[PDB]
């Protein structure tokens, strides 16, 4: 564990971390709506190290927040670079941890990044799990309002899987609900999943939110989500997360 | 005044001063009766009908809620049998349960006993539980609700979706009905916040194969919104007041 710890300290200072991008599509899977930025790690000898191996130790040593801030900046730089090359990726999505969300420096750091890269602020979408917002609703309301002044978009991740409240969900300045993997995998024949998925979609639409389903791995899941009006979709059905070079080349036109 | 009120309340049970009035429920077009919601009222020999806002929280304070509630449940089932005997077409009766009744180990046996004595179809009895009650201890609730559902009766969640929910555990509860609290109805149709939430409750209910009933429908505009967005059932002052059983059938059942 001190072995892995040493390499991870080394990785952030030597710049061995890299971002890979998962494409997001309209619910018929026909056109690109965005890209989700994911932390990866190019080891010198080992090559690409599995996220399930290095991400948990990162959390265990408190580098999660700091690597996360680097990723946010790199994602925005990347999107800016794509936009200048006329590769119109309408947005980039980045996950925020509870730690980053609660950080007093969050709004200022994001403000700085937006100023340095010059991207349209609505092209940046922060993804926050439901429980982060629901743990402290009044503080979440303060923070989210701050972030929304920057002009960015907010997605609520793992919607419906924990406690929530319709009352506050409507009061949160959010834009998007994400349907977690576990509600997509049983589609289209698993009752529990077809109903909860339908319900998330209808709710998002009732609140003027967009909805995106993650974990779309089969044509049949895609058919269900398409016919029931899910706005966007992502998953292995469309390929794997890829490095910026390859992503940029693929979706250039 | 509270001393005399408490004394009178304590006397009201033995002497049978409590009476049920019923709020009618209709289809979402407001054209057909779908049921009666049973409500605790108090016919005092000197004061007339005592305001629920005055006596009900006193009953809560003095620990008689559950005993009266149990009596109320029995009386509503009896009334439904009386109506059916007289060919008064009230399809079902709904009764609110308090948290203390819900927590009572003997609740299932008591309702079973009432259903047996009255002989009504169990599907004619709908129990209403606030979301708060179910959400405080979702494990216990699951087990209690499972036991109540073995009796054949129906289960409604009111004060959805004020407070905290869990789509995830909502799907697991053996419930049949969601009730839209009046705070989401009052703003209809131009209060965008209420229109959005009311829409979302209707949609969640139908995605989960649940019926949805709106409470506190007080204007035609509210009713028009609800009908047009697919609400299954409605109740409120627009259709008139809670009434005792005889007048209820007279005014609302045909």
Question: What are the DSSP calls for A124-178, one per residue?
Answer: EEEEEEHHHHHHSHHHHHHHHHHHHHTT-EEEEESTTSS-B-HHHHHHS---EEE
* Residue in B69, B93, B70, B96 with CA at minimum distance from that of residue B83: B93
Q: Which of B127, B5, B152 is nearest to B72 (CA)?
A: B127
- Rounded CA-CA distance A85/A28 in Å is 26
Apex A192 CA angle, A190 and A196, nearest 5? 120
Q: Which of B161, B201, B208 is opposite residue A195, by nearest beta carbon?
A: B208
Distances (CA, A) of B219 to B30, B196, B223, B225, B235: 12, 18, 6, 10, 11
Are A25 and A233 in contact by the 8 Å Cβ rule? The answer is yes
How far apart CA A39 and CA A70 sit, in angstroms, is 10
Q: CATH number of the domain that A209 lies in? A: 3.20.20.450
Which class for A179: exposed (0-12), middle (13-18), buried (19 or more C-beta within 10 A)? buried
Structure tokens at B43: 């016919």
To the nearest whole Å, the CA of A128 is away from the closest chain B CA by: 18
Three-state secondary structure call for residue A121 = helix
Distances (CA, A) of A180 to A60, A159, A211, A214, A215: 24, 7, 11, 6, 7
Which 8-state DSSP code applies to residue A238?
A: G
Resolution of the experimental model, in Å, one decimal: 2.2
CB neighbour list of residue A97: distance below 8 Å, 6 or more residues apart: A64, A65, A68
* Total structural domains within chain B: 1
Residue A111 contacts by C-beta under 8 Å, 6 or more apart in sequence? A150
The helix (run of H) or strand (run of E) holding residue B126 is strand B125-130
Domain hosting residue A75, numbered range: 1-253
All residues of chain A having their beta carbon less than 8 Å from the beta carbon of residue B166 are 160, 162-164
Structure solved via:
X-ray
Residue to mutate among B195, B200, B201, B205, with most A CBs inside 10 A, is B200
A122/A92 Cα distance (integer angstroms): 10
For B136, residues 6+ apart whose C-beta sits below 8 A from its C-beta are B99
CA B129 to chain centre: 8
Q: Where are the alpha helices (DSSP H) in chain A?
A: 2-14, 51-60, 64-84, 98-102, 106-117, 130-135, 137-149, 166-171, 181-184, 191-206, 219-227, 244-251
Q: Is A170 on the interface with B (CB under 8 A)?
A: yes
Binding positions of A for Mg(2+): 36, 95, 127, 157-158, 214
């Amino acid at each position: 564990r001190l072995e892995l710890e040493s390499d991870l300290r080394r990785a952030l200072e030597l710049g061995e971390f890299v971002l890979h991008y998962q494409p997001q599509f309209t619910g018929d899977g026909r056109r690109l709506t965005g890209a989700e930025a994911l932390l990866r790690w190019q080891h010198p000898r080992r090559g690409l190290v599995p996220p399930s191996e290095f991400i948990p130790v990162l959390e265990e040593i408190g580098l999660v927040a700091q690597v996360g801030d680097w990723l946010l900046a790199e994602a925005c730089k990347q999107l800016r670079s794509w936009h200048k090359a006329k590769v119109r990726v309408p947005k980039v999505s980045v996950n925020l941890s509870a730690r980053q969300f609660a950080d007093g420096q969050l709004g200022e750091r994001i403000a700085a990044i937006l100023y340095e890269t010059g991207i349209p602020p609505a092209c940046l979408e922060l993804e926050l799990t439901e429980s982060i917002l629901m743990s402290d609703v009044a503080e979440a309301m303060q923070i989210l309002s701050g972030l929304k002044r920057l002009g960015l978009a907010i997605a609520v991740d793992d919607f419906g899987t924990g406690y929530s409240s319709l009352n506050y969900l409507k009061q949160f300045p959010i834009d998007v609900l994400k349907i977690d993997r576990s509600f997509v995998d049983g589609l289209p024949h698993g009752e529990q999943d077809a109903q909860i998925a339908r319900a998330i979609i209808a709710m998002a639409h009732s609140l003027n939110l967009m909805v995106i389903a993650e974990g779309v791995e089969s044509q049949a899941q895609l058919d269900f989500l398409r016919e029931h009006g899910c706005d966007e979709v992502q998953g292995y059905l469309f390929g794997r997360p890829m490095p910026a070079e390859q992503f940029g080349m693929l979706y250039a036109s």
